[PDB]
């Protein structure tokens, strides 16, 4: 058993509705107003073919930028300097207001929600995960602290296979006989040697954070993400997040939103944690994110080869470079890149053919760093 | 085999992507921008509990209207007189701009798209279905004309079981071993005694119409619905439609939209087929819808008990009453009701516990008729 979870709707029984019961009362009143949460659905456009390139002033400094963006399968690119959009690019077929999957950039959003709850005193990072999710007793999450989950410093046997099993349990792939029923169940099956302290990137960690969020607030993660973050950004559009059969949002990588709206998250980070709709996280939380995690814990050569003094903390990758760059990162080329020096945010949403290779990583970081430097006063 | 179908995206192979291949190239470029079409997803609100009742002037004539709406599980109710919204009601928990499943009201939208193509001469209702979908040869749709599909005058062995099998084939319910792979396949399995001329309500008919639309335009039904109808309404929001594993929209009942936007469809019908974005259908098509179908074909006592001179044509129910009322209808209480006498449109979106009973039918029609009469000059 995985304990109490936020009901899909007020008064809903556990796990209700399912694909086979949503047309039945009392589920249908809710389902008829949220069918996309139960059945794959397409948008029928209210609006009746070429790339949109508005690189602005950085074009003179980076003449081959558009070509570089094309080479890295860029779908949406936006540079926010201060409160102003100074550069934009959208591939042919992708509108400026279209939403794009964030993959692991979603993790940085989840960490932000956790941070908001820490500020309220509803979550103490020093406490063990089991203080909030007792049902994780007996799993690899039995012993580690919430902060160790936030910093991903837990050794886990996660063949990266656990990765595909995670997808199947969440609805991202077709289920196989015997698979865990939902994401909560999947998490309870995870094991490790018990060691902690060393960084190990594992998407299961973020879903555990979302589970903690649900237990401390009583809200579905989808709602918590809106209440604690999205609804305070004065966003142009709602964001979306895939949900599993219980309605649990895929916190580790299922959020989709527009490039301009994702930039509002970065703006909030560079504004000390304050957004137009109110404070999202404390100044202290933002400071800790920008400061970075323990360098000694970071042993991922894939990251340190490029960023020797890099680290990871609270669901954000910290380059530790001369500019103090920090970034949310997702496979296939997603970045919510922060450049505090120039008070700028760079959003790059892409679709590389591969989830990750040293090649794409090199090209992508080259673009983000060049764009950042192009914003420097001269 | 079911022949050629519109690709999910430009250059996509047949049936691609699937739930197991959307993360792979070249599918991912498209999938990352339309993930809701592959995996159930929830909205993360950009906006930070009580019913909204603005019955306007009809309140004096119908003092117990709100209670009557509550009794019929009303979620959204809107009255458009001319070009003005004169009355509105939304249950607690349902915002004015929230979308609601239309169920079979979706059929009237599909018929409108077919009508647009008839005007262009791309579809001749007198032609057999097989003239456009040869793959339907050998099925109950081998012989009947497109008009007979439009008027639902084809005898079909459709246990209403075929009804649940239809849902499973489309993704509305969990698949069973042996089920047709998609909606197209399901349609080809349908049989009948060969007789025609008598009305038989069957949702399979509308999906055949959508299939014809795809074969004549080369567009996915989802896109055709936008291009030929939705994008010309100057709608506030996009509509949505559930899609099966091939991306085929559930034309017979999977569309969702706001009450105000659905009213724009009625406005177009009362405006001779013209919408703000251009003509949707010809004046003649609208005239034929308002005129009704053959009364002799209408043998559904469930309809004629209330509307003795009623009929059905081109995916619309025609009451044949003294007011000439015509309406799009969907199970659980959905209506796109037209009252030409007062140049008004009444939209009622509900969630009755039951798909249909004489009881709900009586109460619902009582409300629509009373509201219509309340709009009469006095
Ligand atoms: N297992 C689905 C992918 C989750 C996102 C992971 C990442 O972007 O690093
Ligand atoms: N089989 C799903 C329901 C389809 C809608 C049918 C109707 O509204 O009459
Ligand atoms: Na904080
Ligand atoms: Na990694
Ligand atoms: Na027409
Ligand atoms: Na019927």
Cα A28 from Cα B76, distance rounded (Å):
14
Cα A2 from Cα A213, distance rounded (Å):
15
Same domain, A62 and A175: no
Residues comprising chain A, all counted: 378
Cα B271 from Cα B194, distance rounded (Å):
38
The total of other beta-carbon atoms located within 10 Å of residue B328's CB is 27
Any chain B CB within 8 A of the CB of A243? yes
Same domain, B73 and B140: no
Residue-wise DSSP of B146-208:
HHHHHTT-B-------HHHHHHHHHTSS---TT--SSHHHHHHT----S-BSS----THHHHH
Residues of chain A neighbouring B222 (CB-CB closer than 8 A)? 42-44
Given ligand 1 and candidates A101, A104, A336, A357, which is best to mutate, with the most ligand atoms within 8 Å of its CB? A104
* DSSP conformation class of B13: P
**What are the tokens at A37?**
């949460």
- Restricting to B residues 114-153, those with a Cβ less than 8 Å away from any Cβ of A are none
Q: Are B286 and B186 in contact (CB under 8 A)?
A: no
Cα B207 from Cα B114, distance rounded (Å):
12
Distances from the Cα of A32 to the Cα of A36, A64, B106, B243, B345, angstroms: 9, 49, 14, 16, 22
Tokens 């993400």 — which residue? A225
CB pair distance less than 8 Å for A40 and B40: yes
- Restricting to A residues 249-268, those with a Cβ less than 8 Å away from any Cβ of B are 249, 254-257, 261
Distances from the Cα of B201 to the Cα of B102, B163, B318, angstroms: 17, 12, 14
CB pair distance less than 8 Å for A46 and B237: yes
Any chain B CB within 8 A of the CB of A33? yes
* Closest listed residue to residue A56, CA positions, set A362, A353, A358, A346: A346
Tokens 């007792």 — which residue? A134
The total of other beta-carbon atoms located within 10 Å of residue B177's CB is 4
CB pair distance less than 8 Å for B101 and A33: yes
Same domain, A267 and A357: yes
Cα A151 from Cα A317, distance rounded (Å):
10
CA of A46 to the centre of ligand 3 (A): 40
Q: Are A231 and B46 in contact (CB under 8 A)?
A: yes
Q: Are A318 and A310 in contact (CB under 8 A)?
A: yes
Minimal CA separation from A147 to chain B, in Å: 26
Cα A224 from Cα B331, distance rounded (Å):
33
Q: Are A265 and A232 in contact (CB under 8 A)?
A: no
* Closest listed residue to residue A204, CA positions, set A246, A256, A169, A247: A169
Same domain, A245 and A364: yes
Same domain, A135 and A179: yes
Cα B7 from Cα A202, distance rounded (Å):
35
**What are the tokens at B118?**
């008839």
Residues of chain A neighbouring B32 (CB-CB closer than 8 A)? 75, 100-101, 332, 349, 351
CB pair distance less than 8 Å for A233 and B173: no
Residues of chain A neighbouring B261 (CB-CB closer than 8 A)? 46
Same domain, A238 and A358: yes
**What are the tokens at B277?**
């974005």
Residue B289 is assigned to a structural domain of this protein: yes
Looking at the 3D structure of chain B, how many domains does it have? 2
Q: Are A338 and A327 in contact (CB under 8 A)?
A: yes
Q: What angle do helix axes B204-217 and B221-228 make, rounded to 10 degrees? A: 80
Given ligand 2 and candidates B161, B199, B203, which is best to mutate, with the most ligand atoms within 8 Å of its CB? B203
* Closest listed residue to residue A368, CA positions, set A350, A352, A351, A346: A346
> Distance of alpha carbon A30 from its chain centroid, rounded?
27
The 3-class secondary structure across B239-304, one letter per residue, is EEEEECCCCCECCCCCEEECHHHHHHHHHHHHCCCEECCEECCCHHHHHHHHHCCCCCCCCCHHHH
Same domain, B72 and B62: yes
In this structure, the dihedral spanned by the alpha carbons of residues A120, A121, A126 and A129, taken in order and rounded to 10 degrees, is -90
Is B331 touching ligand 2 by the criterion CB < 6 Å?
A: yes
**What are the tokens at B262?**
């659905």
Cα A275 from Cα B105, distance rounded (Å):
42
Which run of H or E residues covers position B67? helix B65-71
Cα B338 from Cα B317, distance rounded (Å):
10
Residue B196 is assigned to a structural domain of this protein: yes
Residue B39 is assigned to a structural domain of this protein: no
Same domain, B110 and B244: yes
Residue B318 is assigned to a structural domain of this protein: yes
Q: Output phi, psi for A84, to 5 deg.
A: -110, 135
Same domain, B194 and B164: yes
- Restricting to B residues 58-77, those with a Cβ less than 8 Å away from any Cβ of A are 73, 75
The closest residue, in CA terms, to atom 6 on ligand 2 is B104
> Distance of alpha carbon A50 from its chain centroid, rounded?
29
Q: Nearest residue of A to residue B10 by CA position?
A: A93
**B218, B253, B287: which is the final residue of a domain?**
B218
- Identify the CATH number of the domain in which residue B132 sits: 1.20.58.710
- Identify the CATH number of the domain in which residue A296 sits: 3.40.710.10
Q: Are B282 and B119 in contact (CB under 8 A)?
A: yes
Q: Are B259 and B76 in contact (CB under 8 A)?
A: yes
Which run of H or E residues covers position B69? helix B65-71
* Resolution, expressed in angstroms to one decimal: 1.6
Residue B44 is assigned to a structural domain of this protein: no
Cis bond upstream, residue B26 (ω within 30): yes
User: Experimental method used, please?
Assistant: X-ray
Distances from the Cα of A95 to the Cα of A364, B46, B353, angstroms: 22, 19, 40
The whole domain housing A166 covers 125-218
The total of other beta-carbon atoms located within 10 Å of residue B299's CB is 11
Reported as half-sphere exposure (CB side, CA atoms, 13 A), residue B88 has a value of 15
* A239-242 vs B41-44, strand pairing mode: antiparallel
Given ligand 2 and candidates B109, B202, B252, which is best to mutate, with the most ligand atoms within 8 Å of its CB? B252
Tokens 């993704």 — which residue? B171
Residue A195 is assigned to a structural domain of this protein: yes
Which residues have CB under 8 Å from A160's CB, separation 6+? A202
- Restricting to A residues 333-352, those with a Cβ less than 8 Å away from any Cβ of B are 349, 351
**What are the tokens at A229?**
């973050």
Distances from the Cα of B8 to the Cα of A257, A349, B103, angstroms: 21, 21, 24
CA of A21 to the centre of ligand 6 (A): 22
Q: Is B371 helix (H, G, I), strand (E, B) or coil?
A: helix
* DSSP conformation class of B130: G
Q: Are B372 and B325 in contact (CB under 8 A)?
A: yes
**A218, A246, A268: which is the final residue of a domain?**
A218
Q: Is B117 helix (H, G, I), strand (E, B) or coil?
A: helix
**What are the tokens at A115?**
């941070």
**Phi/psi-derived region of residue B168, left when phi > 0, alpha when psi is between -120 and 50, beta in every other case:** alpha
* Closest listed residue to residue B42, CA positions, set A39, A331, A167, A332: A39
**What are the tokens at B62?**
């119908």
CB pair distance less than 8 Å for A231 and B45: yes
Q: Which ligand is nearest to the CA of B355?
A: 2
* Closest listed residue to residue A206, CA positions, set A264, A158, A246: A158
The 3-class secondary structure across chain A, one letter per residue, is CCCCCCCCCCCCCCCCCCCCCCCCCCHHHHHCCCHHHCCCEEEECCCCCCCEEECCCHHHHCCCHHHHHHHCCEEEEEEEECCEEEEEEECCCCCCCCCEECCCHHHHHHHHHHHHHHHHCCCCCCCEHHHCCHHHCCCCCCCCEHHHHHCCCECCCCCCCHHHHHHHHHCCCCCCCCCCCCHHHHHHCCCCCCCECCCCCCCHHHHHHHHHHHHHHCCCHHHHHHHHCHHHCCCCCCEEEEECCCCCECCCCCEEECHHHHHHHHHHHHCCCEECCEECCCHHHHHHHHHCCCCCCCCCHHHHCCCCCCEEECCEEECCCCCCCEEEEECCCEEEEEEHHHCEEEEEEECCCCCCCHHHHHHHHHHHHHHHHHCCCC
N-terminal to C-terminal alpha carbon distance within chain A: 61
Which strands sit side by side in the sheet containing B239-242, from one edge to the other?
A: A41-44, B239-242, B255-257, B100-101
**What are the tokens at A144?**
């580690």
* DSSP conformation class of B139: S
Q: Output phi, psi for B278, to 5 deg.
A: 130, 175
The total of other beta-carbon atoms located within 10 Å of residue A45's CB is 17
Given ligand 1 and candidates A101, A206, A253, A312, which is best to mutate, with the most ligand atoms within 8 Å of its CB? A253
Q: Output phi, psi for A213, to 5 deg.
A: -60, -45
Distances from the Cα of A356 to the Cα of A213, A330, B349, angstroms: 29, 9, 47
Which run of H or E residues covers position B361? helix B358-374
CA of B328 to the centre of ligand 6 (A): 13
Question: What is the rounded radius of gyration, in angstroms, for the C-alpha atoms of chain B?
Answer: 20
Residues of chain A neighbouring B238 (CB-CB closer than 8 A)? 43-46
CB pair distance less than 8 Å for B171 and A222: no
Any chain B CB within 8 A of the CB of A111? no
The closest residue, in CA terms, to atom 6 on ligand 1 is A104
**Nearby residues for ligand 3 (ion, Cβ within 5 Å):** A 115, 118-119, 281-282, 285
Same domain, A144 and A253: no
CA of A102 to the centre of ligand 1 (A): 9
Minimal CA separation from A298 to chain B, in Å: 28
Q: Are A44 and B238 in contact (CB under 8 A)?
A: yes
Residue A10 is assigned to a structural domain of this protein: no
The total of other beta-carbon atoms located within 10 Å of residue B282's CB is 17
**What are the tokens at A197?**
């302290």
**What are the tokens at B39?**
């995996």
Any chain B CB within 8 A of the CB of A235? yes
The total of other beta-carbon atoms located within 10 Å of residue B296's CB is 10
Same domain, A257 and A353: yes
Please give the angle made by the CA atoms of A186, A189 and A190, to the nearest 5 degrees.
100
Which run of H or E residues covers position B313? strand B311-313
Residue B116 is assigned to a structural domain of this protein: yes
Query: Which sign, positive or negative, has the C-alpha torsion A96, A100, A106, A110?
Result: positive
Same domain, A328 and A239: yes
Breaks in chain B (C to N over 2.5 Å), named by the residue before each, are 48, 160
Which run of H or E residues covers position B86? strand B84-90
Tokens 């709206």 — which residue? A261
CB pair distance less than 8 Å for A44 and B225: yes
The closest residue, in CA terms, to atom 1 on ligand 1 is A167
Tokens 């001179």 — which residue? B309
**What are the tokens at A94?**
């992708």
**A199, A218, A237: which is the final residue of a domain?**
A218
* A326-330 vs B334-339, strand pairing mode: unpaired
């Amino acid at each position: 058993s995985t304990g109490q979870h936020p009901a899909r709707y007020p008064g809903a029984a556990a796990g209700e509705p399912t694909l086979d019961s949503w047309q039945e009362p009392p589920h249908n009143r809710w389902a008829f107003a949220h069918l996309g949460e139960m059945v794959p659905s397409a948008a029928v456009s209210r609006r009746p073919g070429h790339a949109l390139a508005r690189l602005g002033a950085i074009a003179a400094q980076l003449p081959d930028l558009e070509q570089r963006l094309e080479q890295t399968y860029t779908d949406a690119f936006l540079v926010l300097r201060g409160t102003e959009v100074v550069a934009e690019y959208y591939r042919a077929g992708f509108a400026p207001d279209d939403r794009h999957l964030l993959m692991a950039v979603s993790k940085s959003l989840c960490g932000t929600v956790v941070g908001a709850l820490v500020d309220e005193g509803r979550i103490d990072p020093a406490q063990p995960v089991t203080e909030y999710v007792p049902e994780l007793a007996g799993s690899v999450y039995d012993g580690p602290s919430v902060l160790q989950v936030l910093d991903m410093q837990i050794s886990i046997d996660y063949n990266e296979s656990e990765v595909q099993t995670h997808d199947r349990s969440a609805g991202w792939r077709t289920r196989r006989h015997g698979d865990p029923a939902d994401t909560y169940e999947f998490l309870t099956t995870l094991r490790g040697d018990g060691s902690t302290g060393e960084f190990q990137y594992c998407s299961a960690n973020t879903d555990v954070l979302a589970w903690i969020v649900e237990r401390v607030t009583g809200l579905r993660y989808v709602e918590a993400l809106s209440t604690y973050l999205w609804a305070k950004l004065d966003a142009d559009r709602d964001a979306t997040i895939t949900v599993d059969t219980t309605g649990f949002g895929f916190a580790n990588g299922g959020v989709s939103c527009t490039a301009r709206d994702l930039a509002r998250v970065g703006r909030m980070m560079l504004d000390g944690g304050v957004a137009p709709g109110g404070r999202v996280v404390s100044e202290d939380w933002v400071r800790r994110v920008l400061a970075g995690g323990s360098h000694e814990a970071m042993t991922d050569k894939g990251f340190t080869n490029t960023f020797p003094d890099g680290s990871y903390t609270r669901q954000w990758w910290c380059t530790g470079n001369e500019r103090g760059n920090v970034s949310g990162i997702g496979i296939h080329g997603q970045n919510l890149w922060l450049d505090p020096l120039t008070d700028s945010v760079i959003v790059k949403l892409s679709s590389w053919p591969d989830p990750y290779t040293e090649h794409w990583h090199r090209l992508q970081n080259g673009i983000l760093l060049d764009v950042s430097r192009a914003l420097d006063a001269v």
